[model samples]
Target: GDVEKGKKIFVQKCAQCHTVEKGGKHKTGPNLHGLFGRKTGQAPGFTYTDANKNKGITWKEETLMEYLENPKKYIPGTKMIFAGIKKKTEREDLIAYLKKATNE
Candidate 1:
């Protein structure tokens, strides 16, 4: 999975709701800067749904992969409306881009 391919996927699939850049604008969802090591629902200013705010889950590459596979199934009752990535490679690429972009 190419990082560039993943970035395209994220823009098409997630940019409408989520922002991954540092101090990026938050859309319907929270900004995802430093997401990998962050706790779910901990983003400042964004109002997280009860499910996510209290999910007690930590974000990581492996966990994000699982969550991206099926947002609803992975975290039942999450407010995210995404149906999730159906293609495994796309998910991989997305995560790769996320890791690289957010790290900076």
Candidate 2:
């Protein structure tokens, strides 16, 4: 249930704000398609907060892992407001699922 748990986490924690589909519209956040190699805050058709616009990092596994652990702590001015996963295993599973779902 590796990716299954992760997908469930996404539904519970992230689906309200983000979409993992390619042609999905931005809700509170951008669609997560091809997210791995993409620059932070650079997803098309979405206007990001100034903090995110200047995040100056790419969304790789390591970076995303850190970010998902604590979005506000990782990006001080980011607008994503949620308590982090707090568990390393859950974060890892989520990252794996994201990489596969986003095709990156």
Candidate 3:
């Protein structure tokens, strides 16, 4: 995942609902500051689906891919509210960027 390319993806696909900078404010969705290593739906104060909070999975490179590609299918009621990404390349690049951009 190229950081530069991933930023492009985030700006176009993810930025409306999330903020990546640490301590950034939450949008409609939670801020993705310390995204990795946390449990799904763990971002502070953001409302989340019971499906997500109870999914009982940690956020990591592999899980991010599995969850993000088909959010509605993977976790109904999550209200991810966006259609999943199609290209595998984009997902990998996104997660690669995510792995770096967000810290534990």
lDDT of 3 by residue, 78-104 (tens): 678775775878888888787876642
Candidate maximizing TM-score: 1
lDDT of 2 by residue, 1-104 (tens): 27777877887778778865424667888777667877765677777677766756688889888887777778777767775774777788888887787653
Candidates in order, TM-scores: namely 0.85, 0.81, 0.82
Q: lDDT of candidate 1 vs native?
A: 0.75
Poorest lDDT segment (10 consecutive residues) of candidate 2: 19-28
lDDT of 3 at 64: 72
Candidate 3 TM-score over all chains jointly: 0.82
- Residue pairs clashing in model 1 are none
Candidate 3: misplaced stretches above 4 Å?
none
> What is the lDDT, from 0 to 100, of the residue 7 in candidate 1?
76
Higher-ranked by TM-score: 1 or 3: 1
Any runs in candidate 1 off by more than 4 Å, and if so which? 21-23
lDDT against the true structure, each candidate: 0.75, 0.74, 0.73
How much is the lDDT of residue 32 in candidate 3?
77
lDDT assessment of candidate 2: 0.74
Candidate 3's error at 9, in angstroms? 1.0
